[PDB]
């Protein structure tokens, strides 16, 4: 009942022969997905000495990955989404940290396993289409029913950026996620007729919304493939899409390529944005394109289980509540509580760092070391510290003001500047390298300043960085300078260099 996979069962009971997934021109019904997840999880549990605590899903987005997610939950394990396009080192660190003892892998996933399992040779490997132990898949080995779980069982492991390059692992319990979907189940009105976008990559918290708002309701998630973005009206109309969820970036993209011409997106009933500052001017173009749609801004870090706020766009309210042409994030989820900590570590009635407690709070990372500075003890309760400065209005509407620290958001990608700096020490022909976030029309862009006898080809930076960093976080701006400036206490001056970055880009 608190079980994530129970939401897929709710859909199965409601809409067995309706689509649960449309992807690459293929349809997977709830019945088809159920029977395959029972087979795969049965076969897997047959092949492992113990029920695995953590199952890696090492596949591109698609049907093999969705079946893999269900298989992991059904086996009573934590889902650990892995990206075949990530550098092997990053993927290996995620599998290590998450204690992954079994991998569900597509074609592309399987090519990486010789390297990834080099000395995890134990690992069970289920093919979704000589290191590792090949799982024999047979309907004879099927579970008849999915394994039950307790609220404190880890349902998902997701990684956020770390200051030493090593990513922080967030275990989300079935209980964490059940509190989330109780709030969303009550707020929204999804039915088995709805068709939801699946724009979020499966290593990101917001993909849970796409999959489990859909599946909980008997709806379908659909592929929004790269080419749809240059004719979104035709794609949304042909496929009868009724729920949009993406980053704000996609608004500017769709407008540039195909327009966001008013009345061009009539099929949409819900339009959701999360992961970057949402601009009022962008939201208004999207509302006028999708006039039958409610438009909502959703905010939250991985550590508070996907989203903790929601603001409904109204041309009459949002710019009044909001500041600087940015749409507000909205009031805290019912059943959560916040305290605002100012820059001195003291509570403030209406302005400071947002800290959150209640059943959506993870409460820890996989590695206890990551906990330091990320939790608060106040009023006899443990709060998570977002690093996000907010203002509170009477009636509870929250406005995002900026970051307290030196973490940045590049499109949706939350990254510590220290993560990029650590990777750059590896680089050749370079004296010193420092990464800054440059405020641009597009939000924030990584820029590297570096000393050297001569400029260093971007490809040389890229070659080193791609060995440990996902491409999302690999900068495209490299500026050779004679001298890097130092501050009061003789550390490189990132304030001065952020300003120089800004004046180079706009």
């Amino acid at each position: 009942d608190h079980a994530l996979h129970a939401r897929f069962l709710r859909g199965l009971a409601c809409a067995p022969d309706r689509p649960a997934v449309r992807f690459g021109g293929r349809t997977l019904t709830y019945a088809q997905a159920h029977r395959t997840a029972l087979t795969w999880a049965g076969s897997l549990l047959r092949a492992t000495p113990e029920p695995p605590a953590a199952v890696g899903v090492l596949a591109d987005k698609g049907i093999p990955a969705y079946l893999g997610i269900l298989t992991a939950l059904y086996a009573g394990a934590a889902v650990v989404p892995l990206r075949p396009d990530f550098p092997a080192a990053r993927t290996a660190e995620m599998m290590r940290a998450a204690g992954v003892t079994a991998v569900i892998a597509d074609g592309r996933g399987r090519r990486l396993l010789p390297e990834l399992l080099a000395d995890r040779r134990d690992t069970a490997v289920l093919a979704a289409d000589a290191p590792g132990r090949r799982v024999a898949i047979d309907e004879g080995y099927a579970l008849t029913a999915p394994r039950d779980v307790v609220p404190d069982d880890t349902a998902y492991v997701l990684f956020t950026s770390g200051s030493t390059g090593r990513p922080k692992g967030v275990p989300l319990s079935h209980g964490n996620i059940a509190h989330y979907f109780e709030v969303l189940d009550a707020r929204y009105d999804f039915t088995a007729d709805d068709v939801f976008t699946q724009t979020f990559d499966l290593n990101f918290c917001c993909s849970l919304f796409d999959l489990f708002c859909a599946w909980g309701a008997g709806a379908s998630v659909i592929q929004i493939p790269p080419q749809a973005y240059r004719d979104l009206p035709s794609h949304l109309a042909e496929q009868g899409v009724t729920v949009w969820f993406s980053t704000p970036s996609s608004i500017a993209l769709v407008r540039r390529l195909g327009g966001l011409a008013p009345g061009s997106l009539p099929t949409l009933r819900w339009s959701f944005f999360a992961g970057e500052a949402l601009k009022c001017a962008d939201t208004e173009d999207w509302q006028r394109a999708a006039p039958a749609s409610f438009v909502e801004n959703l905010y939250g870090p991985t550590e508070l289980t996907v989203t903790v706020t929601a603001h409904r766009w109204s041309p009459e309210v949002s710019p009044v509540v909001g500041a600087n042409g940015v749409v507000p994030i909205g009031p805290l989820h019912k059943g959560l509580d916040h305290v605002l900590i100012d820059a001195g570590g003291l509570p403030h009635p209406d302005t400071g760092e947002l800290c959150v407690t209640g059943p959506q709070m993870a409460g820890r990372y996989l590695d206890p070391a990551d906990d330091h500075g990320r939790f608060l003890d106040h009023d006899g309760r443990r709060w998570y510290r977002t690093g996000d400065r907010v203002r509170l209005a009477p009636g509870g509407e929250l406005v995002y003001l900026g970051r307290m620290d030196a973490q940045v958001q590049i499109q949706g990608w939350r990254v510590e500047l220290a993560e990029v700096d650590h990777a750059l020490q590896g680089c050749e022909g370079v004296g010193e390298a420092v990464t800054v976030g440059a405020a641009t029309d597009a939000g924030t862009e990584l820029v590297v300043f570096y000393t050297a006898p001569a400029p260093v080809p971007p490809v040389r930076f890229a070659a080193v960085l791609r060995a440990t960093l996902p491409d999302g976080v690999v900068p495209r701006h490299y500026r050779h300078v004679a001298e890097l400036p130092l501050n009061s206490n003789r550390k490189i001056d990132r304030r001065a260099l952020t300003a120089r970055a800004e004046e180079l880009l706009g």
Binding site: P225, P226, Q227, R230, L253, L257, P458, V459, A462, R466
Partner: protein, 77 residues
């Protein structure tokens, strides 16, 4: 051997490739900077500049992997 228009256009989306270094028939476009945003913009630009339409059939996982495949796909329209 693709035309100048094709290469000039493709180069605007490959920021880990200097102007003075040639574009190889099957360098990995990902490795010289093509991200998922550039891929969409690139698709749009090719359709507008060559007055062609990429059908969902011809848009495999491979189409935008290398210059040689993209040009083969494009000139076959």
């Amino acid at each position: 051997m693709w035309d100048a228009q094709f290469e000039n256009l493709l180069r605007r989306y490959l920021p880990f490739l200097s102007a003075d270094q040639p574009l190889e028939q099957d360098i990995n476009l990902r490795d010289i900077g093509l991200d998922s945003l550039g891929t969409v913009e690139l698709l749009s630009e090719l359709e507008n500049t060559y007055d062609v339409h990429f059908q969902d059939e011809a848009l495999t996982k491979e189409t935008f992997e290398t210059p040689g495949v993209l040009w083969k796909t494009l000139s076959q329209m």
